[PDB]
């Protein structure tokens, strides 16, 4: 709708960012998504499915298919991978992107810290500011869905503004009240 470049960031770039990516893209937003982790982690507690960033969603689908096609259909991981492979080729790492945004949405405070640490670690060149917001999304299919609606609700309200910089703090303040949520908000520079 608006000319806003939006990015949704999580740990793996699998469940929470992709649920929000999918809904924001369907609303017509210029959206990109990233993961803040070292590697892509998929669900024993001590036995996870680990992949490097840049590994195709299709290859991860056919890897967990050949591992156990029945188990990974019952836990909904193959259903998730089906959605992601339709959105883009592979999960991407935020720390490696050269893309610039107007708004960056993190799904948890731990991710927020990783995004802020990373952008602060780099010398600013363009002196271009970016709003970094945190919307707490619990890492499970049901909460990733509810969360994606909140993030879409928040980005839509912000897209309506004729001057986002001048209205953003009041918009967050009323959004927080209505939705009974805490939205951490920082400003970083490119």
């Amino acid at each position: 709708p608006s000319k806003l470049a939006v990015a949704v960031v999580d740990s793996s770039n699998m469940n929470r960012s992709m649920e929000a990516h999918n809904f924001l893209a369907k609303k017509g937003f210029n959206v990109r998504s990233y993961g803040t982790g070292e590697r892509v982690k998929l669900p024993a507690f001590d036995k996870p499915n680990v992949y490097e960033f840049g590994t195709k969603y299709e290859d991860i689908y056919r890897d967990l298919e050949s591992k156990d096609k029945e188990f990974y259909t019952q836990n909904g991981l193959l259903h998730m991978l089906d959605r992601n492979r339709r959105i883009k080729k592979c999960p991407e790492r935020f720390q490696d992107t050269k893309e610039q945004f107007d708004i960056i949405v993190t799904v948890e405070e731990r991710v927020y810290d990783l995004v802020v640490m990373h952008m602060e670690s780099m010398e600013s060149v363009d002196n271009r500011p970016v709003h970094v917001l945190n919307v707490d999304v619990v890492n499970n299919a049901e909460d990733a869905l509810m969360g994606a609606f909140v993030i879409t609700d928040m980005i839509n309200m912000m897209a309506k503004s004729t001057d986002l910089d001048n209205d953003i703090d009041e918009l967050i303040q009323e959004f927080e009240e209505r939705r009974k949520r805490v939205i951490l908000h920082s400003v970083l520079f490119y």
């Binding site: 810290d113 802020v116 640490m117 602060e120 010398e123 600013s124 060149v125 363009d126 002196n127 271009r128 500011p129 709003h131 001057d163 986002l164 910089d165 001048n166 953003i168 703090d169 967050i172 303040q173 927080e176 805490v182 939205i183 951490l184 908000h185 920082s186 400003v187 520079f189």
Partner: protein, 333 residues
């Protein structure tokens, strides 16, 4: 020795510059993107002849078009900085713009423009009249953006704070404790043979801009975005120029003790999280030696553990500490 490349590129941009006068603002931005790529990239020689063609579009009614002109002028000072006196007027004029979106883009571009412009002007041994004109416009640009900290737009204020950060850093002297940054330029890099301006006068201005930022940072009705932006700009200044370390640590100490009552609960948490990060960064600087206990105090107030703070302090030899411990003792008397 010659070839067809320049002529083939000139024919391509002549076509593009001709379409501009009769193109839609949307088509104008597409054309300008192509003109920039060729005239300042692929065939860099063609840049001076097609200047006025692009610079005239600074008057266009569409703000996107005006923003594209800014993007072009910013590239000119990066690759063909000798053209600086011919493009610098447009920048100053565009700071008088009605659209806040245009103002923000101009302030953003002025960061690299002022650094590249300052580097070029003090490099000339026999500077002409055009050089004195360009420096006069650059002086006015600094003053223009300095006024914008009292602008009614929050976005304008945020960009203005960021611009002023680079000026303070350029208009001060680096030292042993300064963070190693590749393209770092200080007053130490400004020659004595330079007639255009004096090192002492730029330092005086840099100190005045810092004093303004320090005061701005301590106001009671500052926005959360402006406060976070100002806190990080003060952190960059102190880590780049540790002479300012004491001043910045004091500003941070005063802020943590007196959070503006205009901040919301979320804004407080956001401001304190950023303050904690800035303090962690400063503690890593060798120049923060004198303020290590003050910084520790604040980090404990902001929830850091003893061991998290301890790991940040740089390892120093006793011969280095004695030099510092004695320099701190002689300066106090």
């Amino acid at each position: 020795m010659t070839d067809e490349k320049t002529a083939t590129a000139r024919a391509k941009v002549v076509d593009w510059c001709n379409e501009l006068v009769i193109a839609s603002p949307s088509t104008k931005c597409e054309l300008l993107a192509k003109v920039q790529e060729t005239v300042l990239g692929s065939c860099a020689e063609l840049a001076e002849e097609f200047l006025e063609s692009v610079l005239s579009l600074a008057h266009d009614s569409n703000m996107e078009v005006r923003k594209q002109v800014v993007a072009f002028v910013e590239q000119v000072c990066k690759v063909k900085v000798e053209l600086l006196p011919h493009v610098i007027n447009v920048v100053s004029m565009l700071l008088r713009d009605n659209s806040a979106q245009v103002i923000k883009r101009v302030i953003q571009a002025c960061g690299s423009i002022y650094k590249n412009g300052l580097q070029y002007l003090c490099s000339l041994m026999e500077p002409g009249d055009s050089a004195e004109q360009a420096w006069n416009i650059l002086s006015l640009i600094k003053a223009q953006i300095l006024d914008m900290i009292d602008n009614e737009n929050d976005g304008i204020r945020t960009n203005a704070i960021k611009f002023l950060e680079g000026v303070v850093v350029l208009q001060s002297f680096a030292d042993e404790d300064s963070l190693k940054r590749d393209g770092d330029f200080s007053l130490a890099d400004v020659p004595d043979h330079c007639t255009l301006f004096r090192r002492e006068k730029l330092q005086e201005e840099g100190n005045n801009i810092l004093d303004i930022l320090l005061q701005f940072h301590g106001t009671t009705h500052i926005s959360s975005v402006n406060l976070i932006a100002c806190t990080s700009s003060l952190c960059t200044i102190a880590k780049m120029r540790p002479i300012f370390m004491g001043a910045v640590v004091e500003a941070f100490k005063q802020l943590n003790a007196n959070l503006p009552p205009t901040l919301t609960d979320s804004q407080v948490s956001s401001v304190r999280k950023s303050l904690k990060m800035q303090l962690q960064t400063l503690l890593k600087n060798r120049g923060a030696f004198e303020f290590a206990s003050t910084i520790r105090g604040m980090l404990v107030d902001l929830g850091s553990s003893t061991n998290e703070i301890q790991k940040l302090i740089p390892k120093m030899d006793k011969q280095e500490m004695a030099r510092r411990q004695k320099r701190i003792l002689e300066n106090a008397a």
